[PDB]
């Protein structure tokens, strides 16, 4: 049945692909070859044209991105080589680096080999490649409580926080063949921070309050054609009510809500004096102000709706099928503000394509 | 097919409704009583105690309504003995003046003869009993657009608005056998109004802004074990943001986020300022205060979103599976801080239960 699987998947995007890149006329020879490889070795291996576009098919089918209408620039590495562990960790460093860009965020996929007879060559730990630590000990919380499973996998294998807000998390992945990941810290030169502060209300400071700049998410796989990269991080600029909406907001998350009141002069007492409201809005405004000032790469949530707008009309051009997900494409704030709300649209999934995986802590 | 439909909406109806109200074994006399008046008459007749449960699970059943909590205090008002054009107008003058209640608004549904064969005996034109005229010619917009065409249809039949941005619409409905609808002015002493002011910006009361005291849907039709109440308007008190984050936030209804960022002194020249989310959150704030102010209830939307995990927690208790549409319960404000947000709903269709139904204008 596997293969099967393959040789359909394969078909599909093969034609969907050529058919893009104005080269039908190569599609039958292509298949030709690619069924004789699978016959032999149980699978194909995809052209670095077929890599690259595959990766992008796969953004631009991401239902809950807003952020597709840039689909077609994103950055391939190809990283399909790689064998060893010490490979594996300059590659994530190397797309840190050329993703942060000085802070000129450039939208980045690295892709490792792929898993072979569902057996993955390298898997990499990480939910994103840059993230906080997370702890929880005798009611005392420290960090991000997002990441506390993972914090605890890493300090059993002999890796040790400082027990700050916001510790960096150090690359953590295994290769096959081994039976415990390897973990590395990273380089604090590679990571670029920005701290938030309000462009009016200078007691906003005293919150210590910082980001990261680039979010790289690690732990998806690539679907390509039948073809299962589960080792492919990729990156885009952060829109800022992630940062300021959720990851600084949630009540399971940073939970500062009542310090951003408390700070910005207002009760954090009646549910209709709107605090919330008020605190999210101006911990937003801030957000996207100090990304700004320092020079960082950052889209607030109704340009990114216009931008969305637009990857719409692209679509509709195109004589593509627009797919997405309205419960992740609408803003987390002021969401009626945006045209996303008011129509709706297709979930169906459509591959190339990023999905879950199991995690293999937890 | 009508007969049999009628039948097994009334075998459910009935078993469901006396299993509530601890009648199960009056279950059984009931349901041979009602298949005898089906097949001697074509239909059946509620009893006054099953119509009101049944109008109270149908306000429960509504996947749509975050206020569903206090479904089992509904004021349910019978006047299937109507015939007349002045008793269906006296009926709307009296909900009018009992659901407002001087303020403290008391949610209520006055229930009409049903649909007969498929032949409705009151038809409502009006969407509220209370709502706004809108127009629209050669370029110039005035009121509420939402109403331009039931408007223009009043127009039509020789009422005439002012054309202040505030025309209280006539009531508007047809009786059987008649080939057009009456129309009656709503009495101004009926109808209570709240000036919009913010409790700490002066110049607020500049946009001249005032809204409706009671939201009073009258163009759904509630349907109960299979029979079809097309005419059965209900009320409840307002949530504070469907007026200040949508009837007057809305580019297509009073569009106002531009007036009220000029009145708290913000520009609204960049998305990056966020100025639409602050004046979102302003307008709001004035909305809740000034109603407060007045004496007319309405509730906030942390307050609403907090009763509703009360109503899942009853359903749960209860027994009862509960159904609920993410997409129209999340608050069209700060939805991430509410805790619908973070979970999912099951949107099964159950009945009892509301429904819309074709306009007779348009
Ligand atoms: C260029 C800037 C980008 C912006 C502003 C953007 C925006 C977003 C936002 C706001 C989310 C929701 C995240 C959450 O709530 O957890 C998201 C989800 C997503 N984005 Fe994008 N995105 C961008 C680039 C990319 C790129 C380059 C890819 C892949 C090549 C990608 C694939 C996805 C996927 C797969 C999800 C769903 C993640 C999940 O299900 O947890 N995005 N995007
Ligand atoms: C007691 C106070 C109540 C509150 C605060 C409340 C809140 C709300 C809100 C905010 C909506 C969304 C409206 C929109 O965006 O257009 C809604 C929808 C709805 N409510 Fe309630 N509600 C209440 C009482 C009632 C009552 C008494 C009934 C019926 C007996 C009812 C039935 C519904 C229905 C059917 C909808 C959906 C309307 C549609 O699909 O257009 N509600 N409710
Ligand atoms: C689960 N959603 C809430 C927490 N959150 C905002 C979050 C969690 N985990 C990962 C991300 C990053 C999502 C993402 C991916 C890319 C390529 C870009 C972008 N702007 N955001 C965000
Ligand atoms: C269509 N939704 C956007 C416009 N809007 C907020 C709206 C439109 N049409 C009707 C209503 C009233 C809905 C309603 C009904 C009841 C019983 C109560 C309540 N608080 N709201 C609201
Ligand atoms: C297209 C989309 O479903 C539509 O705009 C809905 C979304 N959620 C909503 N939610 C509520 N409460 N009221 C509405 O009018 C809407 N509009
Ligand atoms: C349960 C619900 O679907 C869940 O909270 C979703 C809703 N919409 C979302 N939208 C985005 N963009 N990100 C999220 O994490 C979520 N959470
Ligand atoms: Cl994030
Ligand atoms: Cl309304």
């Given at each position: 049945?596997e293969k099967e699987?393959?040789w359909?998947?394969?078909?599909?995007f093969?034609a969907?692909?050529?058919?893009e890149?104005?080269?039908?006329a190569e599609?039958?020879d292509?298949?030709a070859?690619i069924?004789?490889?699978?016959?032999?070795?149980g699978?194909?291996?995809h052209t670095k044209?077929?890599?690259?576009?595959?990766?992008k098919?796969?953004?631009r089918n991401?239902?809950?991105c807003?952020?597709?209408l840039?689909?077609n620039?994103?950055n391939?590495?190809?990283?399909?080589?790689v064998?060893?562990?010490?490979?594996?960790?300059?590659?994530?460093?190397h797309?840190?680096?050329?993703?942060?860009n000085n802070?000129?965020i450039?939208?980045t996929?690295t892709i490792?080999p792929?898993?072979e007879?569902?057996?993955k060559?390298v898997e990499?730990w990480?939910?994103?490649l840059?993230?906080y630590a997370?702890?929880?000990?005798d009611?005392?919380?420290?960090?991000d409580?997002?990441?506390?499973s993972?914090?605890?996998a890493?300090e059993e294998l002999?890796?040790?926080?400082?027990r700050t807000?916001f510790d960096?998390?150090?690359?953590?992945?295994?290769?096959?063949?081994?039976e415990?990941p390897?973990?590395?810290?990273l380089?604090?030169?590679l990571?670029?921070?920005v701290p938030?502060?309000?462009p009016?209300?200078?007691?906003f400071?005293?919150?210590?309050?910082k980001?990261?700049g680039?979010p790289?998410?690690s732990d998806?796989?690539?679907?390509?054609?039948?073809?299962?990269?589960?080792?492919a991080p990729?990156?885009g600029?952060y829109?800022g009510?992630?940062?300021g909406?959720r990851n600084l907001?949630?009540?399971?998350?940073?939970?500062?809500?009542?310090?951003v009141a408390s700070?910005?002069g207002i009760?954090?007492?009646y549910?209709?004096?709107?605090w919330?409201?008020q605190a999210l809005?101006?911990?937003?405004?801030?957000?996207?102000?100090?990304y700004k000032?320092?020079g960082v790469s950052?889209v607030?949530?109704?340009?990114?709706?216009?931008?969305?707008k637009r990857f719409?009309?692209?679509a509709?051009?195109?004589g593509?099928?627009?797919?997405?997900?309205?419960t992740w494409?609408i803003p987390?704030?002021?969401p009626?503000?945006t045209?996303?709300?008011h129509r709706?649209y297709?979930?169906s999934?459509?591959?190339?394509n990023?999905?879950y995986?199991?995690k293999?802590?937890?």
């Amino acid at each position: 049945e596997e293969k099967e699987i393959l040789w359909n998947e394969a078909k599909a995007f093969i034609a969907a692909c050529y058919q893009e890149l104005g080269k039908a006329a190569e599609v039958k020879d292509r298949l030709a070859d690619i069924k004789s490889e699978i016959d032999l070795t149980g699978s194909y291996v995809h052209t670095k044209e077929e890599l690259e576009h595959g990766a992008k098919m796969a953004w631009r089918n991401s239902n809950r991105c807003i952020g597709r209408l840039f689909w077609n620039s994103l950055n391939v590495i190809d990283r399909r080589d790689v064998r060893t562990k010490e490979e594996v960790r300059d590659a994530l460093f190397h797309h840190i680096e050329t993703a942060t860009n000085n802070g000129k965020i450039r939208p980045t996929i690295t892709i490792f080999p792929p898993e072979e007879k569902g057996e993955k060559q390298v898997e990499i730990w990480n939910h994103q490649l840059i993230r906080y630590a997370g702890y929880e000990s005798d009611g005392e919380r420290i960090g991000d409580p997002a990441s506390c499973s993972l914090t605890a996998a890493c300090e059993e294998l002999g890796w040790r926080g400082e027990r700050t807000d916001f510790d960096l998390l150090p690359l953590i992945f295994r290769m096959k063949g081994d039976e415990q990941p390897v973990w590395y810290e990273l380089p604090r030169s590679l990571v670029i921070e920005v701290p938030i502060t309000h462009p009016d209300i200078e007691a906003f400071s005293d919150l210590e309050l910082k980001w990261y700049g680039v979010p790289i998410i690690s732990d998806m796989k690539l679907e390509v054609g039948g073809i299962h990269y589960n080792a492919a991080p990729f990156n885009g600029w952060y829109m800022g009510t992630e940062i300021g909406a959720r990851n600084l907001a949630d009540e399971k998350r940073y939970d500062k809500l009542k310090k951003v009141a408390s700070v910005i002069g207002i009760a954090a007492d009646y549910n209709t004096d709107l605090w919330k409201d008020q605190a999210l809005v101006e911990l937003n405004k801030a957000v996207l102000h100090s990304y700004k000032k320092q020079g960082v790469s950052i889209v607030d949530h109704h340009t990114a709706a216009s931008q969305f707008k637009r990857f719409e009309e692209q679509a509709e051009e195109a004589g593509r099928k627009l797919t997405g997900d309205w419960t992740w494409l609408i803003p987390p704030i002021s969401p009626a503000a945006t045209h996303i709300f008011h129509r709706s649209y297709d979930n169906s999934i459509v591959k190339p394509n990023y999905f879950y995986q199991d995690k293999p802590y937890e």
